Design a protein around this ligand. Structure first.
Ligand SMILES: [Mn+2]
Ligand SMILES: [Mn+2]
Ligand SMILES: [Mn+2]
Ligand SMILES: [Mn+2]
Lengths: 103, 78, 96, 95, 94, 105, 95, 87
DNA sequence: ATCTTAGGGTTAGGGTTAGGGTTAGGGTTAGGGTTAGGGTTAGGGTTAGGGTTAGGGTTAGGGTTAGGGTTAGGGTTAGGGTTAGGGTTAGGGTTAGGGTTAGGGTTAGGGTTAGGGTTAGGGTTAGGGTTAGGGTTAGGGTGAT
DNA sequence: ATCACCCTAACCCTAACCCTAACCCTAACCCTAACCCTAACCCTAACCCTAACCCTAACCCTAACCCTAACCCTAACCCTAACCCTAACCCTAACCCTAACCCTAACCCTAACCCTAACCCTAACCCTAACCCTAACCCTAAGAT
């Protein structure tokens, strides 16, 4: 498989097919699906990492959408990247304004 | 049915947003703003359904309409 | 008997630290079908499509409440008013 | 019925690498699938434009490269451009 | 040298129809050219997606029309969908 | 009529639009009536803009429409403003508007 | 000697009713080359590219002033303060 | 043929009167004294974000000259679509 | 409330820059021949929707109480408006020069074209861990002596 | 603070249901293959951007008086918060009906591709009219008498 040739879990062959099928350009380079599957695999791992940590904190083993939201909004970069995105069943980060605290 | 979105249901959504005091005029203004949002999303969702020559508005049509509106939704098979 | 603005602070934590929906599924499904009928008649809605719409709405409104609250606090207040929702949606590029 | 494609096989594999003593909800897997699809399109579409702007008819890893630099935030882009050039380099070596 | 494409010939033709005495700045023609190009790719790209969503390999006037209904505002879309269906109808006859 | 634009009653280039649709990577194939429909939608919108702009130029005693006239036409229409809401017309300036509380008592 | 307000209100009309740029072309061109230098050295700028950047900047800042002013008026004021620019940017999604 | 003069502190070139003019177009009557620095901060951020992407386009095109198109493509990426300089 | 005074709005024709009319020319759109694959009919499987029954009990809703936030109004500094003048560099049209983009010529390898081969992953089934749900508990502040 | 008051998190109980481990076969990816052209290389042109000279009066900056918007306390008012208990209605739990979606089978016709073709339209050139600029021109309304 091309994924094993590149040291990847993400499907290099599938990404290459989606690039020509999706009407992005006339031709698709040999290393473009390899580079892309790796960038997608990196980002999924970067998310899964912080999400498993949030699941660990909440005494759970299985990451639910709340853990994904907590991981995203607690990062600065993942939040900026997914700034105009809504995680269904994610809820909000717990934050109460300082002026709305007891006197 | 816009009154089905009750004053206590609106108050819960204000609490999640970190709202301490909620004016009485708010409960009506929220109903207005929610109706506008729903109209704009469903209108595009239906335009997708109608283009697909279907009578059933699918989860994908609602997803495509949300993305068009810039309120991209994750988790609905998009 | 709790002081004015103490059950409110307990409620905020109760809901922020939760993810369940805050509008009942049936009144919402009625509103969705009413609005859709005003665009096209003889319409069916996938169970999932309605939930996709409900999630979208609440997430929007909560985010709108966040900005609204920031506007009330900007004008030395603690209570959200229509003038705040209007300033939030105006600067958000929803209103002129 | 029809065939439903998914990145679940790979989201599972990658989860097992970072947290082997951690699992994933059916809803959370849908959120992860939506994330992969969104970012796929974001990068692919940006590379499609670069290819076009420079009168070229091919999306190469150089187009993916600059799309990542444009779309991903500061450090995330640094590490993605790294892991990407890495995987390409390794792929060229092994035929 | 290289040749530079433009919609200036047509922006001029259309200007004379509407205001036969009114003229146009070189900068204003640039703004009009940017407008035509922006709206071209807004509609084309939306039609490209509609075809993809419905597993269709072709962009037909049916995809252009729903893209117009999605992108333009209420009364502008109505008149554009009108003006468009008319030109297509006329084209099919001749 | 030998050009496709003349067959459709258009000024906008039906042949050029058809070429840009294929040459722009939007889909595998381009329908016969899609460039016709599109050139007409673009021609309609340009005429709708040019109309309101010529009016703003005539109000300003000018013969020629400059980018200020285009901006004035866009921002004064409700739909054109919504359509070009997140767009900047270079050399367009702003609509003259002063908030009521900033006015002399 | 005009009262405090009379020259400000005259200036607002003078500029709103006009389209010329409000930052001098040379100080702005230095700022652009300084900033660009700090991303990549040995950079040339097309005369037009700089004007494209200047137009973009002023149009942005004027629009930012519009929202900022609406924030000062919201808190019963007439003068724009940093807390207003910050709230206008917070709500605009710039943070 | 031999040297480029050092570019330094040009954010002050965006003077207090130049900032005043931009406030007038936005319909601003009173302008705080702290504003002139806050505006300089915000303008610098805007310019960094636009030029950064413009240069990423220039670098992709294998060029040393940042064109008007690169600045246009960068502005469109930022959602501040500019009319008039091509495209 | 009358009266001077400095503002833009205006007119003038000076007078320059620019747009639009104009030429010829270079490339693109149109023509009409062949081509095949998307799409469009057809029937007809079947999934998934809405319909309409039911039993609480969760939740919505009116109307009790005072709490303290919003608001008003007046008084307090002091902050940013406005004036002037002397610099102070921005802006004007210069001038040359070569780093830089790039026509346009030539060749090659990258990529698509085909298919038939294995092999990965969709679609299902199912047993069993993780979450769920209900209770009593320690834990930690809430409101008031 | 010091006192009772609530409540929500903390543990440990046992149950519902969905992860995720499982199998099987489908369809997708992969290694045979010729085959065409896009991109790479190399050139030079040729613009165009950079920096170089020149002068200047536009425009900035710096401090001066003080006009007045900002923000302080306080006091009046009622807006909405908390608390309650009657009661509507949302919620699973459950069933069938069959309209709507879509499988995939035949077959037509649309959109592709091709070369020569003429016709638009790019560009390079040229004059004259729009508009730009600075001369006074009265009108107007700012803001002290
Ligand atoms: Mn530097
Ligand atoms: Mn001061
Ligand atoms: Mn040279
Ligand atoms: Mn045909």
């Amino acid at each position: 498989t091309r994924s094993s040739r590149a040291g990847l879990q993400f499907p290099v062959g599938r990404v290459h097919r989606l690039l020509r099928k999706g009407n992005y350009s006339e031709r698709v380079g040999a290393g473009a699906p390899v580079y892309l599957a790796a960038v997608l695999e990196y980002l999924t791992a970067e998310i899964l990492e912080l999400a498993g940590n949030a699941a660990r904190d909440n005494k759970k083993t299985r990451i639910i959408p709340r853990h994904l939201q907590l991981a995203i909004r607690n990062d600065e970069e993942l939040n900026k990247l997914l700034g105009r995105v809504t995680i269904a069943q994610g809820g909000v980060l717990p934050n109460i304004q300082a002026v709305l605290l007891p006197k | 049915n816009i009154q089905g979105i009750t004053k206590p249901a609106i108050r819960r959504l204000a609490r999640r947003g970190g709202v301490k005091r909620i004016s009485g005029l708010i409960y009506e203004e929220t109903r207005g703003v929610l109706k506008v949002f729903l109209e704009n999303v469903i209108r595009d969702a239906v335009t997708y359904t109608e283009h697909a020559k279907r009578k059933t508005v699918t989860a994908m049509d609602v997803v495509y309409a949300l993305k068009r509106q810039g309120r991209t939704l994750y988790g609905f098979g998009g | 008997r709790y002081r004015p603005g103490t059950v409110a602070l307990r409620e905020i934590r109760r809901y922020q630290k939760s993810t369940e929906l805050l509008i009942r599924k049936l009144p919402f499904q009625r509103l969705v079908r009413e609005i859709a009928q005003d665009f096209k008649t003889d319409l069916r809605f996938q169970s999932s499509a309605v939930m996709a719409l409900q999630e979208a709405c609440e997430a929007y409104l909560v985010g709108l409440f966040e900005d609204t609250n920031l506007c009330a606090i900007h004008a030395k207040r603690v209570t959200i008013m229509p003038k705040d929702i209007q300033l939030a949606r105006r600067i958000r590029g929803e209103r002129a | 019925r029809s065939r439903k494609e998914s990145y679940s096989v790979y989201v599972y594999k990658v989860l097992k690498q970072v947290h082997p003593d951690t699992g994933i909800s059916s809803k959370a897997m849908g959120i992860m699938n939506s994330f992969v699809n969104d970012i796929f399109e974001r990068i692919a579409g940006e590379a499609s434009r670069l290819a076009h702007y420079n009168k070229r008819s091919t999306i190469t890893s150089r187009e993916i490269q600059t799309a990542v630099r444009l779309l991903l935030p500061g450090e995330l882009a640094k590490h993605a451009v790294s892991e990407g050039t890495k995987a390409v380099t390794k792929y060229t070596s092994a035929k």
